[PDB]
Amino acid sequence: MANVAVEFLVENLMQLLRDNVELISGVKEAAESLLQDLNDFNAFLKQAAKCHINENEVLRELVKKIRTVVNSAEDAIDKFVIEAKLHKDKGVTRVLDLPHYKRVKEVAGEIKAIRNKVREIRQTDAIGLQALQDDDLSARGSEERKPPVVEEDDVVGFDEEADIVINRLLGESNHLEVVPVVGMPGLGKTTLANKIYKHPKIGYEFFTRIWVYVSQSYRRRELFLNIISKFTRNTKQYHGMCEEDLADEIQEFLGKGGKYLVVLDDVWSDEAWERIKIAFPNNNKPNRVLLTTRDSKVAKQCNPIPHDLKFLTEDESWILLEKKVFHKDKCPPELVLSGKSIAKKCKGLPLAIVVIAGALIGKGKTPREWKQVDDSVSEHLINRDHPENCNKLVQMSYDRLPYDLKACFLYCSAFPGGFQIPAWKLIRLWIAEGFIQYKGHLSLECKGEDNLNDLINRNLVMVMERTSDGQIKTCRLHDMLHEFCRQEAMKEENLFQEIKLGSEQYFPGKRELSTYRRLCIHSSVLDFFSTKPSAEHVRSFLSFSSKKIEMPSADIPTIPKGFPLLRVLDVESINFSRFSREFYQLYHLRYVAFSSDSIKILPKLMGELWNIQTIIINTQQRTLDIQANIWNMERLRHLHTNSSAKLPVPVAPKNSKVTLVNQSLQTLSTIAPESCTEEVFARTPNLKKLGIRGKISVLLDNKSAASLKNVKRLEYLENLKLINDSSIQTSKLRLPPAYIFPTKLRKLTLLDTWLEWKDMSILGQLEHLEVLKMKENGFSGESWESTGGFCSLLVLWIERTNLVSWKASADDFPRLKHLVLICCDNLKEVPIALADIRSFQVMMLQNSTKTAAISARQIQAKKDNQTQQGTKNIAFKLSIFPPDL
Amino acid sequence: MANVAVEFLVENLMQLLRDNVELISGVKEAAESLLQDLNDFNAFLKQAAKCHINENEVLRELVKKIRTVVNSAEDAIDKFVIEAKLHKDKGVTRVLDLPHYKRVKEVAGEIKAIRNKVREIRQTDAIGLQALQDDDLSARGSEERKPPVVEEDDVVGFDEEADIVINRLLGESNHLEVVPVVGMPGLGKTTLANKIYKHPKIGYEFFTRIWVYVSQSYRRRELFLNIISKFTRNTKQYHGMCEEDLADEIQEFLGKGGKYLVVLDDVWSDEAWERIKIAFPNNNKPNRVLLTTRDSKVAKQCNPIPHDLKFLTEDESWILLEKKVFHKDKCPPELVLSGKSIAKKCKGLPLAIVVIAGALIGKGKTPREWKQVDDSVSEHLINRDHPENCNKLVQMSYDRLPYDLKACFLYCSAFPGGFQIPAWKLIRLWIAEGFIQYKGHLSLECKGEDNLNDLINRNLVMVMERTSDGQIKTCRLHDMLHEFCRQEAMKEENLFQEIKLGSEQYFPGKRELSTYRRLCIHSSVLDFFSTKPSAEHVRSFLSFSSKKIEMPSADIPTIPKGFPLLRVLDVESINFSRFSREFYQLYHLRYVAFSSDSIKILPKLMGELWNIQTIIINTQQRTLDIQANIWNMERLRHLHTNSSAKLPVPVAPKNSKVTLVNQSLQTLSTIAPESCTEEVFARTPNLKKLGIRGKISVLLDNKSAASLKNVKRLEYLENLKLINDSSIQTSKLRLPPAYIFPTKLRKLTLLDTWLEWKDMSILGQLEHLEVLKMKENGFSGESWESTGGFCSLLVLWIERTNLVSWKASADDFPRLKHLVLICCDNLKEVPIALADIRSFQVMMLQNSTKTAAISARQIQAKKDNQTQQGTKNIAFKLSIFPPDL
Ligand SMILES: O=P(O)(O)O[C@H]1[C@@H](OP(=O)(O)O)[C@@H](OP(=O)(O)O)[C@@H](OP(=O)(O)O)[C@@H](OP(=O)(O)O)[C@@H]1OP(=O)(O)O
Ligand SMILES: O=P(O)(O)O[C@H]1[C@H](OP(=O)(O)O)[C@@H](OP(=O)(O)O)[C@H](OP(=O)(O)O)[C@@H](OP(=O)(O)O)[C@H]1OP(=O)(O)O
Ligand SMILES: Nc1ncnc2c1ncn2[C@@H]1O[C@H](COP(=O)(O)OP(=O)(O)O)[C@@H](O)[C@H]1O
Ligand SMILES: Nc1ncnc2c1ncn2[C@@H]1O[C@H](COP(=O)(O)OP(=O)(O)O)[C@@H](O)[C@H]1O
């Protein structure tokens, strides 16, 4: 939508005028003029949006060229800004910088012609404003939306295929067999196969169970490395071994672990199965493979008997729609006939019905909306076999979205097919692109999380992984939605364009690449950069690859010089050895991610990019030294890192009264303990997440820095992590008293502190802490005895400890819901008093002593009797690692 | 509740341990013990609150003797803190200074005996936990509450008595006659009388109309000063007059305004009417006065025929109940029988029904709750005429309130009966008393406002005046609610104690005062301070008088020396010549208000008080100079003033890296223009309100306009005020461009800037501004022509300008709701296009030309025609203050 670009340009111009007067100084009148005209433009596009522009040709004619004239302005202003900052570097103290001030004033001549153009067009727009304001529709207020807790996890009317499949498997002893499943896209082969892979009988039967996704763009060796990973810890060794030997190693590991069930998803080409099957050892055991698909030929080839999936009958259809649109509550009677007619209109496709329930949630729950939706569906599914019917249905759902979500959905279609989207990165990309604008009081990140939850609710985006906290950790887009969104973006809106290279084709020429605004290259990238492209109007550049590619020493300069107007640059999948000066000459850079293996210092010139919001760095060295004045970069909001970062020593200005305290700074992913000082925390009042890697001892000792005591100043801090990199128990470490920590702290992580279990009382004293995660021998001992305090703790996580005896009472953990016990191969039993807590719902116990498993089964039987006893308890689910136990 | 005191002590001790380590260095061990013990008792009392406490004597014994212990600990800790801070001022560098640290360390010995007693209680209270694990009631989640828009403005079934009285009045023209009304308290005499005083016929008949609330606590001379103020512009002439001459002057002015209707409310004693009546000139006019009362005797005395009021019948009863509990929606059928049974039991009392509707909102909308409240209301209204039948019903409603709202509702009875509570001050007092504890993300002020709205919703608190923008401005409690709350506080909770000098009340001795925790003296207070009281354990002190009382030069030491442990101190009704040296040793002072007439400097000693949150200074000087280090005091949240305040020049610590940036500061009432600087605005990031009184020229001068340009830096600023004191139009003033102002600014006020009307284009560009108030010739000119831009402006307020011509179109102000036009004595036209704006609903026009009134009547006719045309328009109310216009 043109509104997005208009708003972003207005905001950036305002920020540049307020903040940096000197750069814009030669053209201030033109800046203010463009500001007024863009405000008026935005109002006009809103008024046009109120109407159905597609209904009138004149309205559609009017919108065109609103966007091009706006685009011409953005270009001229940005070129001017970069030119004048280069002038500042020139340091021409001449009063009249006649040489090359006439170049920045050539850009200003373009600016002036552009201001003249914008003054025009605005006069024509004033014509037809009154006529447009005569008409309006959908005059209503805005309501709230609510978080997407799990709902309808049960699968309507699909027990039949589940039981048939679970029956078929385990037929012939000592045979490696494959179970094909087919059925048109959106039917639910993955959903049913998930229900199988999570049915109790399957987990009872086979010990090893691997979930594997194999699309068309799948890679064989990438898959083998990960499957070997399922068994062992490190794959960096097998980065240097052949696929065949890798196939052999997977075979040995998989054969060792008794039986095995392996799931490969959405296969496309029979040769794909032919190649992948090698790793599986046919060692004369009843091991079952479960592949699903869409094409019939491959299913038939891999086994002469494919099990075809089934459509949902009319009743299943209506019940499913009722569930999705009305969630737990039951439908009010008046809409029943409408909903049943729509369900019948669907023909029993779970995908069409699901998206339609999303559209109904979007419209409302009033009879007029239901009748209109019924009429529209009765029109857009006249055929069955044509997939574009699903596209028409999704378009109908899509039309009702707010334009802000319209931008986010398309931009979520940017990622490659089959790629699992990291939610935090997706939110930060949305922020840096300008799709989320200040409205209200929520922090930008919270608004982004709410937007993602909204998109999940109407069933456009399917969630894949969730956190311990219950939040979302990784999402993606179903194939049909990906195709519809990609076509809509690359064709209509020109949001972005992709450059995947088919056989016997060439990367476009400079004239074509001239008309792009964003690039995505998810295929051979070094090949596009060996050509030395040049497109002055590329603002973003995305490359979400699978492997890590090295960048040749003679090829580093190409990105900075080819695209001198970047804003977003995510090349996390490309490893750099260094950087060139043109890099530090990129002055519009907002988002910047990159990897590296020999980087140790963040050069100081990097602090001259005065618009950076986000920074993400990967480095193999333990210590990363930062020399750029991050206290100078006003708008910095995040600084991620995987090594231990050594922040610079802060100094306030001497001749300037102004103090350097960043109000908008929310993260310091991993800083060294040496910098956990009073001043570092004086400068970050609003900090919400902090991490410290290094030798946690320096913190805990009270000589060098009362560092844990320094932590008291961060009032809003809500997440902390203590990572120790020393591998030597030089002394014993002691946590300070529980009045030093912040009050809202909600999630803590320890790793190799090696603390004594008596200190757990201090943590019990904390009030709001909701998740405790101690990994890799965080607390050392053999005797912990609960002493109360964990009033609100919701998830407990213990991994790689030598604890033996634990003792508690049902009043120690009143709100427990989740309990994680990993790699505790020296614990004996879990206290049974944990079976008394009502909310205790999920437990898991990995690589643990079998006596603990027997006690856990006792606890499960206890809670089963409780729920049987008429209490309104939440259902009980257990998990014990041993297949036998 | 004991919970609130427990929590406040815990929080204060935590803050003391964190920030001031040295003060509590000698006792930190007892301090930490006590801190853990107080957390344990907080949890204990929560569990006790789960099980019913009112009904059980064992519980009401157990809870006692914990409060005594916490109070003893509080007193010991506070005495320790004061003596140790005096030790800091002593500056004894001796390693071992026994004198006055032996007595301080034996104050720590008292602390140690108290910690021992707390340990004993800890051991004892653990006994008796077994029963608490058994019992728990009202286990449920918390939902949201919504802001109080007007509900049931219309009065159910009262129209008939309004008819009788409106018909009754005006019968014998040319006579001064009083109209009494009688009907038991809580029946609605003032509701009906307000309905009359706002009936169109009344305003049409009489020109002048006055509202004057009266009560037993009335004061005549104040009444007249108020009665004459309503007519006059300057009260200076009448201030030094005699009460009889006050009567004379009110007589003359009341005669000037032709006829008149005067309303006097809740007259108690005939002597009152006899003493008041002289001021009314019985000038042989058809003038009317309206009295209402709860007593028959005085009503008979005033006139031999009082019109006794009626009770609501059953239908009106149930109608009122459904209205109050369901607002604009209709009751679900199942609850109809219950609601009607309750309404019938209520006998027809509007107050009983209103309170029961409030209780029903509080509980829920489910049949079990309705049956419960029904079976309880049948139980508590056995008698009829008697008042206590009402008190019991309030008890039923009040029982369900959260323990947080119970404290605030009780604390609202501190104010003397018949006092209109200033809402902002009330919220600030609640904050300083610790009643509102940080919960969530809302600012403390927002949480307080929400709490007040909640209290209003249940119909416990009656609103009196609202602001321009629709918010609350002052409130009060109905008499019976005040009596119930007063007894409940003074007797059961010992929340506070009043000392009302009756004809036979005489000031308690030192022993009795040894037991109070808070005082309220709303009577002669100089008389109480002539006695030189002494009570170490008084924490608050409140005196909300109506007059201003000057403090004798010999009694300024009495407040500090008598009460050396003060926390809150509101004596805004007592003028101070100066402050004695003990004021600067009230180190616990959080809230401090006072007045003055000769103060010009806040001496630097004031900055030594490290806990001050709020400061209110009401000085008659034109300029107030501040020398206390505002940047040193860390918890400062507000600073209110009358004179152009001249803040000190900021300085950073030379030898310390610390930066003096207050995150909590949120107000500066009237700063001097000279101090507005980037140095100051750098220190106050979250500032939300700013005011600048002085010579606005320095600001608005484009050459020195760097001032408002500095104002550009406050991101969250939401309210700004420009007040000019100079009476000389020395030059013409121009607003800087609209990209300098913050983006969220919602309300602007100008006063004597004398700006050209062409500049209103700048203010049009601002997007979110919702209320514009220009007073006392803000914008000067004779020709303003609207140029669009006021996208979201809701109220327009023009006062005392020589504008003559105004031109606009219905697209100029799309969202206007209320238009205020006062003292515009030279306007000739009100563009008719304002009648095409649907949002426009209330209009006003005061001291304006007749042609404007004609145009306004045409506008009302137009909107009436529109609403007649089937459009869903919000009903239109027009008002011209002088009816003959
Ligand atoms: O807050 P309000 O209830 O709306 O009172 C406002 C205003 O207050 P704000 O602009 O800060 O909101 C002023 O009250 P104070 O700020 O001084 O406390 C005062 O006008 P001045 O700026 O000239 O002081 C005037 O109240 P009053 O009529 O008692 O003088 C006015 O009243 P409104 O409520 O009608 O806006
Ligand atoms: O499950 P989560 O709720 O995501 O919690 C953590 C955490 O994530 P958050 O701090 O954002 O909540 C870590 O995030 P990052 O370190 O990448 O910033 C991540 O990595 P760490 O191991 O270093 O904590 C870790 O993932 P994992 O432990 O698997 O590596 C993950 O916990 P999960 O195990 O559930 O992913
Ligand atoms: N039996 C079912 N009941 C309700 N919804 C279903 C069912 N089966 C699939 N879905 C819906 O279909 C989507 C899952 O996609 P899916 O059909 O498994 O992809 P494919 O079948 O193409 O591999 C989800 O939105 C899910 O809610
Ligand atoms: N029909 C009604 N008559 C009188 N009061 C009503 C009615 N409906 C609601 N109320 C509410 O009852 C409250 C108490 O009445 P009020 O007029 O204060 O008592 P009184 O006039 O007897 O002192 C008022 O705030 C009013 O809003």
Numbering used by the authors:
A (entry chain E), B (entry chain A): 1 to 885
Article, verbatim:
Unlike most NLRs, the plant NLR required for cell death 2 (NRC2) belongs to a small NLR group characterized by constitutively high expression without self-activation. In this study, we discovered that SlNRC2 forms dimers and tetramers and higher-order oligomers at elevated concentrations. Using cryo-electron microscopy (cryo-EM), we performed structural analyses and found that SlNRC2 adopts an inactive conformation in both the dimeric and oligomeric states. Structural comparison shows that SlNRC2 dimerization and oligomerization act to stabilize the inactive conformation.
In addition to dimers, the 2D averaging also indicated the presence of a small percentage of tetrameric SlNRC2. Further analysis was then conducted on a subset of 611,661 particles for the dimer and 159,294 particles for the tetramer, resulting in a cryo-EM density map with resolutions of 2.84 and 3.17 Å, respectively. In the cryo-EM structure of tetrameric SlNRC2, the interaction between two dimers (SlNRC2A–SlNRC2B and SlNRC2A′–SlNRC2B′) is mediated through ‘back-to-back’ contact between SlNRC2B and SlNRC2A′. One lateral side of the LRR domain of SlNRC2A′ contacts the coiled-coil domain of SlNRC2B. This interaction can serve to stabilize the coiled-coil domain which is not well defined in the dimeric SlNRC2. SlNRC2A′ Tyr739 is in packing contact with the side chains of SlNRC2B Met14, Arg18 and Glu32. The carbonyl oxygen of SlNRC2A′ Thr743 hydrogen bonds to SlNRC2B Arg18. The symmetrical packing of the LRR domains of SlNRC2B and SlNRC2A′ further enhances the interaction of the two SlNRC2 dimers. The stacking of two loop-out regions dominantly contributes to the symmetrical interaction around this interface. In addition, SlNRC2 oligomerization may lead to sequestration of the signalling coiled-coil domain, which is disordered in dimeric SlNRC2.
